[PDB]
Design a protein around this ligand. Structure first.
Ligand code: C2E
Ligand code: C2E
Ligand code: FMN
Ligand code: FMN
Ligand code: MN
Ligand code: MN
Ligand code: MN
Ligand code: MN
Lengths: 392, 394
């Protein structure tokens, strides 16, 4: 089974130059007996390599390549099965693009390779035309940042539920943007643990009802000028005819403003019925409450949803964040949600941010609002401690 | 009830500069009795106006504003129900951005506006305002791509067959080149795919869908396949519920004098997403075989770029729903521009389909579409290659 692997990487710019003639010859000598072929592209700052061979030969080679100190920021762009070798007879071969006139490098490629409808070919072009695009800038290296560190956890009695709060942060302004309320059982357990105790047919009712205790928690904080974010299933919003009006009454009694309350609905559940949700949407807009699409990029129905309606906020799902520093796929998609939301005036939050590596690459694709264990953990009935990225 | 209406537009650079003083006086004087507030930004080439008022008032005004000869390329950005007026003052203020340095324009805006208890940056209107001040010229339509600077410039039935195919050219206007042909199934009487499949038993539809393609392959083999690609439409089930569909297609296209790489399979976006994990083995086999894969009708229904996380197609066809009235829709403009950029980063080819007007071609090309399919260029041609119309100057 033939397979194609493509990645891009960067040189260490303050270190002595790597002898690439030696690298490439040694590589070509090693690749061909093992049934590995392909090319290397160098532009002065970045590498771009295509590899062809069996799944097993490429995996073992790429592990060595990943851990090679002679470059950094290895980002995979393509891993897929292949119909034929595009570089038959070429173990390895470098093209220094700086030695080439316009179109010249591509025309050399085409003369030893074995045409514009190919995914490998289009990416090559894309690297030659604009390689420095998803290059991680020097200030935004994870090694040039440092996370720096008191919460008051409290049990509230006489309550059928309680809530933890997680900060959504804007590290560029060292500012809390908003807090998300996350439901907990009476004994501090998970959302699942909470809803499992409630009878199945009362779960929509309970979901709506429980929000009153989150508003109360926001009121006694006393929150001030920060937004409150709240997870509701669409079905909970259809429970009572005046579910929106009840939310309003409840949040005002907690001393909150409507523009201060934001509703989080999951991407998968909105696409179920646009007929009944739009009546709720209209009620939320008229009342002044804001809407967010939670876990965007997970439930398949992505960016075309904006044709039907536009939320105030979009929360990028954790799956798009996991290993976004090594995935070109994820980088491209996330960066396209950013740019689309910027033109539409939609707030973008990245979720499940756990590592400096994740924060840096997300910052480099243009995300400013962040939510994750890296910055802030859920804190039962209070504001938890917040960690900020500090420069080096 | 209260409504927001935000748009941007572009002045005619050919014509004399617009009297803004007369504009703003008659605007604010007419707006005042009608209960219309808001703001107007101007950068020299572009207008950007926020309008607040009742739904019926803003509709009536937008009619006149769209009809106004003092500007063109009116692009609607936001229209929704509002809870409170962001601009509370009388009438209409004008803010010439040329006379402000960085951050200075937002300062001035915040003098005439409140955005609730929370930071102004949490409001969509304020974000759209900030975006215009930062880079309003982004979706400004260039001069060479104005519609007024362009203009547009036989085979029979085969009823004795179980089915026939119409061919439609996918074109690249810039290089005056036909990129590929799509095969669209037709009934023995020349009728639509719907009528065709309606005549086939439900238990037999998948098999028919796959086995019909032999007639499409035979058609393209009889035609000048001059290093052009052939696109064909298949349901997921048609590939999935066959013993070895890829092998069958391989046998059928090779027999007809075609290369594996000349054949591209189109699958509809909606029918793939709730099917994917089961459908993986077929997509894999098509890759190894050498055939190409397109996501047909991208944007249609309930799917998007989140699909591209899973697997990556060779081609993406933006649905006509997104191409429809893209010239007046900033939402579609932003969506399509984003998909184009995304696919460039992923090495995925993009076709805009259902292109009907010079207007659509212009706006699509400006946001980075190079490949087109629609009635503007080429209509479906039964059993042959149709006449392709090209856009040229004046
Ligand atoms: N691995 C990882 N996880 C992180 C990170 N940051 C936050 N999380 C977790 O992600 C969940 C918040 O996202 P969610 O879409 O609201 O996912 C929530 C939310 O959908 C939900 N939920 C919470 N409250 C309610 C509610 O009142 N009603 C409904 N219907 N659902 C709720 O149940 C889900 C489970 O929530 P939680 O236990 O609160 O788990 C929280 C949070 O702990 C991180 O950096 N890494
Ligand atoms: N208004 C407008 N329409 C345009 C324009 N350009 C093309 N079309 C039409 O859009 C349809 C092609 O899009 P499709 O995604 O393949 O959507 C097609 C395609 O999915 C499909 N179909 C065609 N052949 C087959 C087939 O063999 N198998 C399957 N499963 N579906 C097929 O049935 C759908 C309807 O097809 P058609 O009657 O052939 O109608 C064609 C075509 O006539 C345009 O500029 N404006
Ligand atoms: C940009 C880059 C491309 C590389 N390409 C290859 C290659 O194609 N084949 C290979 O064997 N090693 C390649 N390497 C080197 C490997 O990381 C590793 O050092 C080498 O395979 C060690 O093999 P050896 O110990 O047998 O000499 C590359 C390294 C870098 C920096
Ligand atoms: C960019 C621009 C913004 C405009 N804004 C307004 C406005 O806010 N209110 C208004 O009444 N007319 C506005 N107009 C003018 C209208 O298009 C139209 O000329 C106006 O209704 C005058 O018609 P009249 O004969 O009833 O006075 C605007 C025109 C332009 C080109
Ligand atoms: Mn949530
Ligand atoms: Mn979430
Ligand atoms: Mn099609
Ligand atoms: Mn289509």
């Amino acid at each position: 089974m033939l397979t194609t692997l493509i990645y891009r990487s960067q040189v260490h710019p303050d270190r002595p130059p790597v002898d690439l003639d030696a690298l490439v010859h040694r590589a070509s000598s090693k690749n061909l007996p093992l049934g590995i072929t392909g090319i290397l592209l160098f532009n002065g700052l970045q590498f771009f390599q295509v590899l062809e061979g069996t799944e097993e030969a490429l995996e073992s080679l790429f592990s060595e390549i990943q851990s090679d100190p002679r470059h950094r920021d290895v980002v995979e762009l393509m891993r897929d099965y292949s119909a034929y070798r595009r570089f038959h007879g070429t173990g390895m071969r470098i093209l220094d693009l700086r030695l080439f006139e316009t179109d010249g490098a591509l025309e050399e490629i085409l003369r030893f390779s074995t045409p514009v409808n190919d995914r490998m070919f289009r990416l090559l072009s894309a690297f030659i035309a604009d390689g420095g695009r998803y290059c991680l800038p020097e200030p935004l290296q994870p090694s040039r940042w440092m996370m720096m560190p008191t919460a008051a956890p409290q049990h509230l009695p006489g309550q059928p539920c309680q809530f933890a709060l997680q900060a959504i942060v804007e590290p560029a302004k060292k500012r809390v943007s908003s807090f998300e309320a996350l439901i907990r059982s009476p004994t501090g357990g998970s959302p699942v643990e909470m809803f499992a105790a409630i009878a199945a047919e009362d779960r929509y009712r309970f979901d709506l009802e429980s929000k009153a205790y989150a508003f109360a928690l926001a009121g006694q904080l006393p929150l001030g000028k920060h937004q409150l974010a709240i997870n509701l299933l669409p079905g909970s919003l259809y429970h009572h005819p005046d579910a929106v009006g009840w939310l309003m009454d409840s949040l005002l009694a907690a001393g909150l403003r409507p523009d201060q309350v934001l509703i989080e609905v999951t991407e998968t559940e909105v696409i179920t019925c646009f007929d009944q949700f739009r009546k709720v949407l209209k009620a939320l807009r008229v009342a002044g409450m804001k809407l967010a699409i939670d876990d965007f990029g997970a439930g398949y129905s992505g960016l075309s949803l904006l044709t039907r309606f536009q939320p105030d906020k979009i929360k990028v799902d954790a799956e798009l964040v996991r290993d976004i520093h090594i995935s070109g796929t994820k980088q491209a998609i996330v960066a396209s949600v950013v740019r689309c939301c910027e033109d539409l005036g939609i707030t973008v939050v990245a979720e499940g941010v756990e590592t400096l590596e994740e924060w840096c690459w997300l910052q480099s694709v243009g995300i400013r609002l962040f939510q994750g264990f890296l910055f802030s953990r859920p804190c039962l009935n209070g504001i938890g401690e917040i960690c900020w990225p500090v420069a080096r």
